[PDB]
Design a protein around this motif. Structure first.
Motif, short mmCIF file in Angstrom:
data_model
loop_
_atom_site.label_atom_id
_atom_site.label_comp_id
_atom_site.label_asym_id
_atom_site.label_seq_id
_atom_site.Cartn_x
_atom_site.Cartn_y
_atom_site.Cartn_z
N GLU A 1 12.14 43.18 70.66
CA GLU A 1 13.14 44.40 70.25
C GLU A 1 14.25 44.75 70.53
O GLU A 1 15.20 44.98 69.50
N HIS A 2 14.70 43.71 71.58
CA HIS A 2 16.60 44.00 72.04
C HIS A 2 16.90 42.91 71.66
O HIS A 2 18.27 43.03 71.15
N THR A 3 16.77 41.70 72.38
CA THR A 3 16.80 40.42 71.80
C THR A 3 16.60 39.65 70.88
O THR A 3 15.21 39.90 70.49
N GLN A 4 16.92 38.86 70.03
CA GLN A 4 16.92 37.53 69.16
C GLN A 4 16.28 36.07 69.43
O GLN A 4 16.89 35.75 69.92
N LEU A 5 15.40 36.15 69.80
CA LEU A 5 14.24 35.06 70.27
C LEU A 5 13.04 34.15 68.84
O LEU A 5 13.16 35.15 68.09
N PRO A 6 13.62 33.40 68.23
CA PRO A 6 12.34 32.57 67.69
C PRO A 6 11.04 31.92 68.10
O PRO A 6 11.34 32.57 69.45
N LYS B 1 19.09 50.73 79.27
CA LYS B 1 18.41 49.36 78.87
C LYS B 1 18.29 48.11 80.20
O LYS B 1 17.51 47.73 80.29
N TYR C 1 6.93 43.51 74.60
CA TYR C 1 7.62 43.88 73.99
C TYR C 1 8.75 45.18 74.29
O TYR C 1 9.88 45.13 73.10
N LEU D 1 20.98 31.42 68.89
CA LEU D 1 20.22 31.23 67.94
C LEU D 1 20.88 29.60 67.45
O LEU D 1 20.63 29.37 66.41
N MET E 1 12.78 54.52 77.20
CA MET E 1 13.38 54.43 78.39
C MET E 1 14.14 52.65 78.20
O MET E 1 15.70 52.55 78.95
N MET E 2 13.78 52.17 77.64
CA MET E 2 14.60 50.45 76.85
C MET E 2 15.49 51.04 75.79
O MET E 2 16.67 50.86 75.95
N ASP F 1 22.00 36.01 74.04
CA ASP F 1 21.45 36.18 71.94
C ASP F 1 23.11 34.71 71.64
O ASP F 1 23.21 35.44 70.33
#
Ligand SMILES: Nc1ncnc2c1ncn2[C@@H]1O[C@H](COP(=O)(O)OP(=O)(O)O)[C@@H](O)[C@H]1O
Ligand SMILES: Nc1ncnc2c1ncn2[C@@H]1O[C@H](COP(=O)(O)OP(=O)(O)O)[C@@H](O)[C@H]1O
Ligand SMILES: [Mg+2]
Ligand SMILES: [Mg+2]
Lengths: 95, 262, 134, 259, 136, 259, 262, 107, 128, 135, 105, 96
Positions: B107-112, B80, B103, A23, D134-135, A20
């Protein structure tokens, strides 16, 4: 977190390589590398695959000026991940 | 240095039961092999680890608090770390194969967008699916669906890679492929892997702790090499496959004299 | 999780039947009595009116086994309580072809159980033809 | 019986009562979270491809067939009274009240009601429901509530196009084939209730039929056994249960605000 | 396809609104001071009864008022604001539309303003007093 | 467009011309052999169990829900013409001519129409269609002809019970709830139409619907992809193809012997 | 002394072939083992022998006339001699288990009612299903469906029993059941058996003729003992599970230099 | 075919509705566009629509509102006696009601 | 019995048998009037209460403005005198109007006619 | 099973036969020589019209036809052979069932096959009924 | 309901059909069982079903047919002035085609 | 391909071949086939099948009730090879 420091032409990374923290070091990474001759870092704990893209994204915009960048001082964990995803030797030091 | 411990969880059904006072431990750095025939739980034991269903009395601990008796927002942050696969193939047919591996980490972490393309494509070389990143997932081979689910299984931080029944029926051109993926992920990352494959020659050559159990009761808790020679006619039936033994092999309902006379 | 999905099913079933229990509605009233000689074509649940506005309804109409005269049980709602005893009932027809409705002509106070003496029956078509032509 | 003949309450009586409780918690745990307008904006357009426009194939061809059977049958017994000028009272009035949202809701349970039950059933056999669970993400707010909020927006929009095609279809047998009127058919519906209790009753019973059809078809796919025979029994159960949800619920609505 | 569905959904949403304006503008219906008017016989008036002058409808009826002592109904009418020149000599009657149709208000035409009570009215005649007065 | 925009005749046009004839080739090979009366006698009664009495639950409760909703709507506009004693002209004539074998035939495709394609599809998924043709005889005249001979007698045994439950259900609200007459209800249907041109049409329009409904349900189950995705497509397509077989074929039946 | 003599066939369905110049012989008294990975024809070869589907141009015989295009009445009399089983189990669930085994011999031969009960109940001891004669076949175990298909396969007088994919995924308790049932039928009835299970730690111990082929062309036609040692990197991928070999194993992309940069 | 409009002022139009047919001797010759009112006299001013096939109609035509059937709506009867774009018919006759005709017959 | 080509021609023959079931589903005179009432097209004419034919159309006179209608009489009935009167009668009480030729003692006109009487001025003439 | 399904189709076939007799016997009516007459105004008569003597139905009519010489509406009607004691002096009248109803032959009492009954009573039309009320 | 049968003879029954509601004072007391005819004079001999609660009926009662509908429906009314009796004081129904002849001529 | 039988006293020598084709003249005639026969011999059959082995046990229940013992000799090894395949416990075969 992730911290950046030049110390001449070394571009040392002191912050932890997390998933994280990419960014803030994304819009300033074009002006980050300026004639860096040797990437050196010794203050990280672990390396993630989501954070492994920055070590590969720093090669293409730095080789177009006409200077090679050497990569040393890293642990053997990035070399076990080098054979894991079959990283090419033209962008890797292969040490 | 254990990760998950199960202390006598039963999960009793409406008329029957599945487990009777089992004891399971998982060490750090070793491969846990849960083996057994039909009659016991194989895929319903790992669903108690994630917390998708409510078990019976007993305590299961993922190195901390209780898993199925916690809050909802805390359960989504601990589950997770597992990111398990499935046997039939946990691949969405509505999207492409480039979006199937992506997928989780979208939606878990933020990547460009230039950073996201450099993380999902590099994960496909460990399973050998980098060139197969722009085709429809409507057609695959017999072993290609398990490689795509494993490439997305390590997109997050891995701690418990539960292989949901791998290579149970396959051709031998991929039998020496998927069991190599057990050894590669366990050694390079140092994380634990749980395999529930019951085929005796393949999983016992890469695992260090075998768990042979029958008649819904745990009987073997040793290693993979110390369970071959022991004087009891209960675990030699599963290792050396023969016809007779603890099974009745007749399915009796009479005496074979009352029938077939008229 | 067995009993958790059982107690919630009783609450949704009782809430669904609560809206279907009180549905045939679309009152402390006092009953009245009247004795006519020929009703005509009245039926059950016929509204009684005082001057065009609906004031109540008719419950039923039972016959007397002694005098063989029709007795109608008309009802008045919570209003229209102050009325003298000199009123008169006259069955009328709503419009030109519609159904019949009881009409109270305004003329002590009629309490719960009091009957009215002044009544006016209907006029059959067979009587007006025989009276006009003869 | 009395010793062993009580299986209709201890075993069969508890089987009906148990499925009514699981459908209540599935709707309650999927309508309490705040929906994201910036995240579900490319999600609702994909859900309208297999619900809204995919069910429009049976509307454009059979919608003219509802108005053409009533136009011919409004001529056999009408010539005895010479009431041919009131054809809008027999075609337009008898279509938006109890013929529109009942036939269109019955056809919604065969094209969209049976496909939404099988789509959840095939993903449980391939184990695609628990892979999202699950995730991090609950499947009740990922694959359920887009399929629930699209059902309450399709059937009110499928019935307003159903009443127009039958009114135009009634004119093909009302002023074109039979030729009894030219302008008297369009003026016969001008003396009726426009917006008091006729068109608003075409909306309050269509959005109720949009709830009770999409609630059973999403629950039968969620309560299906993940085998090859479980997804076939659930597709047969979602049609017979929705048939009692359209015809059985119609009786309690004609006694409300209809005289 | 994420592009072919958008051009088929968008032509479906416009079909729902062209079907909605066909039953709104091409239908029966798509700034009104009130008066007071007592009566003696209503007959068949209900809510939203058409108030008319000269045969053409000019207003509607909001509600109904009743008297607790004299038992005389009061129809609350609503004349539109375009006509504010009604004299005091004009009466109000209740006529029937045709022979078997509904009943409506028919005003047979100081300036009447808001907050006034019409006193001169002769509503209608009932059928029971029509045959009873013709024969007797 | 012209060089590549002709895919609707060269590729798509040949595809729709192949499904209409494969159902005709299989039924022609299933109606040429002589049936055995002594061998098929315990066979036809088994096919009447999953078709006949398993589709009876949507008739005993939903049969009164058709006649009662017309009994409430036979009071709104009928009282304006004072024809309350003529209730039999809308409760007896409009329940067998244009309403009897068009709703029960459409409800036949929900319970006993959609399970027939699931029957052949599940056996082909478990490898039972090819297991029979190699031992004794091909299953076109073994398992399909009992499904077709019990399919032709299915609607004339369901339409006569459907027209009486609507009369008995309609009389529960006309003479009991409303309470307008007691002998005028049963006598108004005696002066109506009789056995001359409509009840002889009901027995011939119900058997022509039992052929075309069972023609598609036995074709989609026999001609399908033997997988978990092909059985879900056959159950969704047997309803929309039978909806065009009863609502698209009643228009040409109302234009015959009806003036 | 062969049973079926098949020559070069392709059977191209709409665009691609399944075979390319194949050859096979079946000896009388031996077990023919035809293996292969996923992608080349295994099950559809058995359907071409029976002649249910229409093949392409090729010369296949059954020691006499042509199989798929001889007649209509006599073709049913010659196809009943095979009586093969299936993988998932060819058991009709709409009837009892007493009728599934009594199906192919009820109307074929004329047997009375007390004589039919004496011949349908004896075969249930040969697979161990003697008590499985009065209950519904709606529920079974993982290996009970293959034994019930074998009890009805010996109802006729066969000369080849074509085992359609046995124990492809099973527990070793029942995988060791059918490894002796092949030898007991060959040593008593004297007929031929065709097993197509694509896993050989136990097939080569009981079979005598293995058929290993790759890239839809036949390459190995030896015995069960002379195929393990041969100097060619084409059939060694099937014997022991390895990573590399004749398989592609990676599916490489275009350039591996400019991708995943933007 | 280009329909010209006219005007007519009555005192009581009766039960006239929109799109009412006008008639010259029992046959429909046109329709009625709308019914308006005067804000100073309160009289029903109704416009008429007459086709271009018949043009020589005098302004002394007695306009009497007749009933369409026997108990339903009403229509216009253009009884000619012995008109251009935008004219008013002078000879007008109002309609009747049932309550006013029985008052003269009784008293 | 082919697989693909033999099944094409049987589809049109079942479709052609369906469209054939849905496809199929005198000398005139002149008689003018003054007030035709509420008559329209397809109105049955009669000779005293039994239907013998219908009408064609309704036209007007462009100079004198009186209704002139045409009517059709079948060729089975020819002996109709010139003094045959024509009145406009109604069928029942609420039914539509019709024409009835009162017989007395192609291209021929009827002199004596009787127009329809509207009841809006009959009650006014009864009192005034 | 082979016997449990026999009972369920047993009660299903009798339920269809019970439902069959409910519409043709209870709902509808029970279903299991000619004369000659000449009228002057039949009104709205048609085929299958019931003829009545006394006030009950005794039969229907064959057809309605005409005459190419006399131009009078001749009607062909048939009755039951049990009701043959009706005298010849009987005026055939065409009345209606109430105000709004079908036109039926209302015969009054005061025959042979083919008897032309001469005394008749034509139907009433409304164009001279309201004309005689004024004139 | 326990009822007892009666008989009555008229001249013209009018539009009286089966199951017609007989009444007294406007309240229904039974139904008409069957409508018969005479084999010689052809007169309508009706039968009546009166409930057991209404027994005090004199022999001087008058029966007359009144209209209860514009579609031909009529009903009987018992006007008060055992088992198997016949009322002689009857009055026939009225016909609209017959009553207009007396007013005209 | 026919099934014939010859008693010859106390032998019941099946001269014809034993198969599953024809079994009707030997099925209902089994009540008069064996009454007190104490020995069964056959040497002219071709092969035995699974439908014919049921007939060998059908001649035991009505033979032991009369008061006699039946032995079986001279048969081939095919009925003894299939003895272990069906697990025939007792009073079916002499196992010699
Ligand atoms: N929800 C359920 N419904 C019916 N049976 C169940 C359910 N869950 C578990 N079982 C039974 O419990 C047993 C546990 O076996 P399991 O290890 O889950 O098999 P698998 O690994 O094939 O899923 C199974 O045989 C299954 O029949
Ligand atoms: N009738 C058919 N329809 C569609 N695909 C077919 C058909 N026959 C063969 N194939 C394809 O040909 C391939 C041959 O594989 P095969 O050895 O038959 O697999 P299996 O042994 O599982 O039947 C299969 O992958 C299958 O997809
Ligand atoms: Mg499993
Ligand atoms: Mg296969």
């Amino acid at each position: 977190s992730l911290s950046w420091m030049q110390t001449g032409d070394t571009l040392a990374l002191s912050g932890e390589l997390d998933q994280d923290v990419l960014l803030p070091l994304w819009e300033m990474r074009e002006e980050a590398v300026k004639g860096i001759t040797c990437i050196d870092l010794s203050r990280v704990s672990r390396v993630d695959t989501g954070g492994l893209a920055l070590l590969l994204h720093l090669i293409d915009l730095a080789k177009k000026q006409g200077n090679n960048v050497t990569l040393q001082g890293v642990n053997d964990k990035v070399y076990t991940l080098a054979k894991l995803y079959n990283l090419p030797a033209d962008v890797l030091p292969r040490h | 240095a254990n990760l998950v411990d199960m202390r006598d969880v039963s999960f009793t059904r409406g008329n029957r039961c599945i487990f009777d006072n089992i004891s399971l431990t998982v060490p750090r750095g070793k491969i846990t092999a849960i083996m057994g025939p039909s009659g016991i739980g194989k895929t319903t034991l790992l669903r108690l680890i994630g917390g998708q269903i409510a078990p019976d009395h007993g305590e299961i601990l993922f190195d901390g608090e209780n898993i199925p008796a916690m809050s909802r927002s805390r359960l989504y942050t601990v589950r997770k770390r597992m990111s398990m696969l499935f046997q039939s193939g946990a691949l969405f047919t509505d999207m492409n194969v480039f979006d199937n591996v992506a997928y989780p980490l979208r939606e878990h972490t933020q990547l460009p967008a230039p950073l996201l393309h450099s993380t999902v494509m590099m994960k496909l070389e460990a399973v050998g699916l980098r060139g197969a990143a722009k085709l429809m997932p409507s057609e695959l081979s017999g072993g290609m669906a398990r490689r795509a689910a494993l490439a997305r299984a390590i997109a997050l931080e891995p701690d418990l890679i539960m292989f949901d029944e791998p290579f149970v029926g396959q051709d031998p051109i991929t039998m020496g492929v998927l069991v190599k993926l057990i050894s590669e992920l366990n050694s390079a990352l140092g994380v634990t892997c749980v395999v529930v494959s019951h085929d005796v020659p393949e999983v016992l050559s890469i695992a260090d702790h075998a768990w042979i159990l029958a008649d819904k009761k745990i009987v073997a808790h040793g290693s993979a090499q110390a369970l071959q020679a022991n004087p009891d006619p209960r675990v030699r039936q599963f290792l050396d496959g023969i016809a007779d033994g603890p099974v009745p092999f007749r399915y009796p309902a009479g005496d074979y004299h009352a029938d077939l006379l008229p | 999780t067995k009993k958790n999905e059982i107690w919630v099913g009783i609450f949704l079933l009782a809430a669904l039947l609560a809206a279907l229990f009180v549905c045939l509605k679309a009152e402390p009233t006092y009953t009245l009595y009247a004795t006519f000689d020929n009703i005509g074509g009245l039926k059950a649940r016929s509204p009684v009116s005082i001057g065009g506005v609906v004031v109540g309804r008719v419950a039923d109409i039972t016959l007397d086994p002694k005098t063989y005269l029709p007795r109608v049980t008309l009802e008045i709602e919570q209003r229209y309580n102050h009325i003298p005893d000199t009123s008169s009932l006259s069955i009328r027809t709503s419009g030109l072809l519609g159904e019949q409705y009881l009409a109270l002509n305004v003329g002590a106070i009629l309490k719960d159980g009091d009957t009215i003496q002044d009544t006016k029956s209907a006029m059959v078509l067979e009587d007006l033809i025989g009276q006009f032509l003869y | 019986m009395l010793l062993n003949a009580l299986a209709s309450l201890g075993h069969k009586g508890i089987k009906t009562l148990r499925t009514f409780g699981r459908a209540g918690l599935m709707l309650f745990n999927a309508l309490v979270g705040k929906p994201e307008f910036r995240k579900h904006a490319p999600l609702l357009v994909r859900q309208l491809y297999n619900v809204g426009v995919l069910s429009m194939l049976i509307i454009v061809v059979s919608g003219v067939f509802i108005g053409m059977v009533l136009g011919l049958q409004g001529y056999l017994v009408l010539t005895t009274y010479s009431a041919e000028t009131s054809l809008g009272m027999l075609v337009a009035l008898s279509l938006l009240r109890e013929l529109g949202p009942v036939v269109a809701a019955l056809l919604f349970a065969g094209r969209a009601g049976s496909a939404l039950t099988a789509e959840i059933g095939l993903m449980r056999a391939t184990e695609q429901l628990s892979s999202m669970e699950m995730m991090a993400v609950d499947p009740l707010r990922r694959v359920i509530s887009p399929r629930f909020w699209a059902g309450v927006i399709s059937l009110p929009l499928l019935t307003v196009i159903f009443v127009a095609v039958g009114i135009w279809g009634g004119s093909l047998v009302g002023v074109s084939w039979k030729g009894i009127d030219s302008g008297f058919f369009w003026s016969a519906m001008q003396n009726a209730v426009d917006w008091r209790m006729d068109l608003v009753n075409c909306l309050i019973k269509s959005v109720v039929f949009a709830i009770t059809v999409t609630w059973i078809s999403l629950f039968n796919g969620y309560d299906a056994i993940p085998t090859s025979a479980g997804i076939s029994r659930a597709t047969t159960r979602t049609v017979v249960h929705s048939s009692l949800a359209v015809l059985g619920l119609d009786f309690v609505l004609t006694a409300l605000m209809f005289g």
